[PDB]
Amino acid sequence: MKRQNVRTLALIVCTFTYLLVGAAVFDALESEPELIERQRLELRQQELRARYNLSQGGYEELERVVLRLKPHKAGVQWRFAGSFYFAITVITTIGYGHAAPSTDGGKVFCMFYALLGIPLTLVMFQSLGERINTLVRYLLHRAKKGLGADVSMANMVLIGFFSCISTLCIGAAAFSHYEHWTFFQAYYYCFITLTTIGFGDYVALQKDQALQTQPQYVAFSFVYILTGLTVIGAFLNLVVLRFMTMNAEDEKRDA
Amino acid sequence: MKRQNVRTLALIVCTFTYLLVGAAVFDALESEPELIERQRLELRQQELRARYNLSQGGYEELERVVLRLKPHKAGVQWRFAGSFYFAITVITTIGYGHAAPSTDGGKVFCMFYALLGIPLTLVMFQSLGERINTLVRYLLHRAKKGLGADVSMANMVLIGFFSCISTLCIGAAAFSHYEHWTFFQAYYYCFITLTTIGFGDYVALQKDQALQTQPQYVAFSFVYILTGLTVIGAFLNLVVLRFMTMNAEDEKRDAENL
Ligand SMILES: O=C(c1cccc(OC(F)(F)F)n1)N1CCN(Cc2c(-c3ccc(Cl)cc3)nc3ccccn23)CC1
Ligand SMILES: CC(C)CCC[C@@H](C)[C@H]1CC[C@H]2[C@@H]3CC=C4C[C@@H](OC(=O)CCC(=O)O)CC[C@]4(C)[C@H]3CC[C@]12C
Ligand SMILES: CC(C)CCC[C@@H](C)[C@H]1CC[C@H]2[C@@H]3CC=C4C[C@@H](OC(=O)CCC(=O)O)CC[C@]4(C)[C@H]3CC[C@]12C
Ligand SMILES: CC(C)CCC[C@@H](C)[C@H]1CC[C@H]2[C@@H]3CC=C4C[C@@H](OC(=O)CCC(=O)O)CC[C@]4(C)[C@H]3CC[C@]12C
Ligand SMILES: CC(C)CCC[C@@H](C)[C@H]1CC[C@H]2[C@@H]3CC=C4C[C@@H](OC(=O)CCC(=O)O)CC[C@]4(C)[C@H]3CC[C@]12C
Ligand SMILES: [K+]
Ligand SMILES: [K+]
Ligand SMILES: [K+]
Ligand SMILES: [K+]
Numbered sequence: 001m002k003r004q005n006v007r008t009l010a011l012i013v014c015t016f017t018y019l020l021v022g023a024a025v026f027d028a029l030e031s032e033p034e035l036i037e038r039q040r041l042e043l044r045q046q047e048l049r050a051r052y053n054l055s056q057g058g059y060e061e062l063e064r065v066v067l068r069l070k071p072h073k074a075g076v077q078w079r080f081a082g083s084f085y086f087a088i089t090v091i092t093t094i095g096y097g098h099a100a101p102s103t104d105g106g107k108v109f110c111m112f113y114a115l116l117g118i119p120l121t122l123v124m125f126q127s128l129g130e131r132i133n134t135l136v137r138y139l140l141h142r143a144k145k146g147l148g149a150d151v152s153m154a155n156m157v158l159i160g161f162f163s164c165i166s167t168l169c170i171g172a173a174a175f176s177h178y179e180h181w182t183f184f185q186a187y188y189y190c191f192i193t194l195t196t197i198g199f200g201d202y203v204a205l206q207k208d209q210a211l212q213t214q215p216q217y218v219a220f221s222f223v224y225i226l227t228g229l230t231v232i233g234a235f236l237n238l239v240v241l242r243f244m245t246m247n248a249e250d251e252k253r254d255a
Numbered sequence: 256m257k258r259q260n261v262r263t264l265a266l267i268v269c270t271f272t273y274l275l276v277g278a279a280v281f282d283a284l285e286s287e288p289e290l291i292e293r294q295r296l297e298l299r300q301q302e303l304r305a306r307y308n309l310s311q312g313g314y315e316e317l318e319r320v321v322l323r324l325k326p327h328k329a330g331v332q333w334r335f336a337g338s339f340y341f342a343i344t345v346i347t348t349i350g351y352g353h354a355a356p357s358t359d360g361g362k363v364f365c366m367f368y369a370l371l372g373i374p375l376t377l378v379m380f381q382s383l384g385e386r387i388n389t390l391v392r393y394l395l396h397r398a399k400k401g402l403g404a405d406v407s408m409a410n411m412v413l414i415g416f417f418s419c420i421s422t423l424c425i426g427a428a429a430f431s432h433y434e435h436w437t438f439f440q441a442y443y444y445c446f447i448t449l450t451t452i453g454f455g456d457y458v459a460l461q462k463d464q465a466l467q468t469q470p471q472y473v474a475f476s477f478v479y480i481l482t483g484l485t486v487i488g489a490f491l492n493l494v495v496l497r498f499m500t501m502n503a504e505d506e507k508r509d510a511e512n513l
Contacts, residue, residue, distance in 0.1 A: 008386050011379040018375060019342050022368055026338035029361045034333040037357065041324050048317055054307060059317075062303050066321040069296050078289045083281035087274050090452060097352060097454035102292065106284040107443050113277055114450050119495045120273060124266040126499040131263050134506065188362050195369050197345060199352035200455055240374045241499060244381035244492070251389060 004250045071099060075209035081218050082211050088225060091117035094198035098206060126241070129234030133160075160235040167231045168194070171224055178217055179207055194228045257509070259502045326354060330464040336473050337466050343480060346372035349453035353461060381496070384489030388415075415490040422449070422486045426479055433472055434459055449483045 049059055076082055077099035089095045090113060101107045136159055137151050144151070168190045176186035181202065189202035204221045205211050211218060304314055326332055332341070332354035344350045345368060356362045391414055392406050399406070423445045430441035436457065444457035459476050460466050466473060 004386065004389075008382045011375070011382050015346070015376055015379045018346070018372060019339060022342035022345070022372070023335055023339035025364060025368075026341055026356075026361065027333065027335055029358055029364060030333040030338065030356060033358050034327075034331070037323075038327045041320060041327065044320055045324065048320060052307060052309060052313055052317070058307055062307065062309075062314075062317060063321050065296060065299050065303055066318050067325065068292075069300060070322065072289075072293045072296060076289070078282065078285040080278055080282055083285065084274060084278035086281055087277035090277070091270075091273070093348060093451045095350075095447065095452035095454045097456055100454045100456040101281075101285060103284055103288050104439070106281065107439075109280055109284060111443065111446050113280075114446070114452060117273060117277070118450060119491070119498075120266070121270055122495060123498045124263075124270045127259075127263045127266050127502050130502040130506075131259070184359070184362075188366065191366050191369070192350070195373060196348045196451065197350035197369060198453075199350045199355045201352055201355040236374075237499070240377060243374075243378045244496060245500065247382050247385040247389075248492075251385075 002250075002254070004247050004254075007247065007250075074098065074203075074206040074211075076212055079212065081205075081215075084222070085205060085211065085218075087113075088222065089198065090114050091121040092225070092229060093118060093196045094193060094225075096198045096200040096203045098200055098203040125229055125233035126237050128230050129237045132230065132234045133238055136160075156238055160238055163231050164235055167228045171228065174220070174224070175204060178210075179204055190228070193225060194232045196229075257505075259505045262502065262505075329353065329458075329461040329466075331467055334467065336460075336470075339477070340460060340466065340473075342368075343477065344453065345369050346376040347480070347484060348373060348451045349448060349480075351453045351455040351458045353455055353458040380484055380488035381492050383485050384492045387485065387489045388493055391415075391418075411493055415493055418486050419490055422483050426483065429475070429479070430459060433465075434462055445483070448480060449487045451484075 045059075048054075054062075071077055077086070082099065086099050090110060101110050133156065137156065140151050140155060140159070141149060168187060171190040171194075172183050172187035174186075175181060175189055176183045179186065179189075179202075181189065185202060189204070192199055192202065205214075205218055208214070300314075303309075309317070331337055337354060341354050345365060356365050388411065392411065395406050395410060395414070396404060423442055426445035426449075427438050427442035430436060430444055431438045434441065434444075434457075436444065440457065444459070447454055447457065460469075460473060463469075
């Protein structure tokens, strides 16, 4: 069997077994607490329904209003700052879902915007990320000869890995201060943001109408998300990206 | 100025102006309808508070319970099928947020799981995507000689672009049937899923306890998300990926000549 076919089949087996391992671990850690939380909340639902004399339909009518008011609770999500924050989540593939296009036309433009945007943003982060790696490579080379010279891959992975933790820590310290979260909650938010997972369980600028009332903090969160993705993007360009073109290189080697 | 530095500065200017254009368009399409729905919902909030004799604190107490019961409403989100669906959203960077780690330990494991998982899944989709492109290149070459031969980039972009639409069309057809959405809503869901945006406004397997009661549809949903990301990932490997190594190639070209 060809090297390309062995590498591909191994990766498929690895990904599927990694999914089976993950599903097994996430079951052990989250199955029992979810069952505990459901029964606890159902007891709280029955207690408050009895306290405020509510029927099955009576609770359900109030249930729909509370759920539909959730994106409005954070404030105006669609003005210039609201739409700029949303535009980021689309092209950077974060997509928290805190604000989503409610209109048919908005949904269409969002698709066309993503089609051209996502590749443009991806190429931008890999290009700027490479310039940072080249600057780091030059600065380290100049520092090596300065003290009394060759920059290795291992030195680049070390600086790269530390730069990623530093970006998560600088962020965590700031988001725990402004969004009033714990350092761990803010660290978890920064991880999920910069890895483009963006669950939406933690979203910045969604407290005390920050998008319209706090421009200085909005300016920082836009700068942090963009600079942070460049730091992670630089590490991907250095370590991850080289394994994606691997199949094309072996196909060229075969010819 | 160097070619690498001009290309990087142009991309930064392009991305920021694309953000300003987007923010301007999303303002025009969503500002007025959001203001309309907020005022409509605030009146409905006041109406139902008056109907069921609710105070400021009374509504707020019921508000917390309704919000906390939202992930439970869809059913059991953390059994084998629920956790497998969640594991997908993490490593594929979709992350709908329909189900999120409620425990401190679950949040930690998710971070470690993502750290190794995301690069593994990304490399897997680019590797399997390349094998699909190579198979398509071979099948077209054999078909060309069959009718009476050289496969160009333009032919590959055409087949690739059609393969992406067909995946969204097959998907929308299924998701509008099982998740009872419109073809457009299911097409929008498929687009947002396969582009790894994953807002969470549309999430499959969250209707009629599908994760625990419908195994056949769960198996399809996992297969579609995984095969669909390979189809999109193949097109990226063909068109987008070549522009990422561009700066490294010019840096190598600078060293070679000098
Ligand atoms: O899964 C895919 C995929 C695979 C097939 C198709 C497809 O569809 C399409 F690309 F079209 F959206 N996406 N990814 C491709 C896009 N992103 C990559 C990405 C990262 C990143 C990556 C990994 C880590 Cl650990 C941390 C940050 N950061 C950014 C910032 C802006 C833009 C993109 N970033 C996520 C991975
Ligand atoms: C902190 C983060 C950013 C680190 C990311 C680590 C990656 C660089 C790792 C994670 C999984 C690894 C892959 C896991 C499995 C394989 C199959 C393996 O295949 C073989 O050994 C058979 C073919 C051959 O001999 O080439 C080749 C390496 C590869 C792609 C690995 C390449 C490196 C990967 C992408
Ligand atoms: C290369 C990097 C380091 C610099 C890029 C330029 C920044 C200085 C720009 C890019 C985006 C800008 C932000 C885009 C949007 C807004 C919202 C704006 O707020 C409003 O318009 C409030 C009313 C509304 O929401 O309509 C205030 C400025 C701010 C934070 C901008 C501040 C300046 C920012 C961060
Ligand atoms: C349907 C989807 C998947 C199509 C994706 C289209 C991409 C292939 C496009 C979108 C934005 C484009 C970029 C927009 C701007 C530039 C800057 C441009 O820079 C210059 O012209 C100056 C330097 C030089 O001359 O090389 C080089 C091409 C590049 C990276 C483009 C490369 C091709 C990109 C990534
Ligand atoms: C290379 C490709 C084309 C094939 C990959 C193998 C598939 C046939 C596997 C991979 C993941 C599997 C799924 C993983 C999880 C589940 C949930 C499982 O449901 C339960 O365990 C219900 C109870 C619970 O939630 O704990 C039923 C089988 C199913 C759909 C599996 C069916 C078979 C799947 C789609
Ligand atoms: K997301
Ligand atoms: K993503
Ligand atoms: K995402
Ligand atoms: K999300």
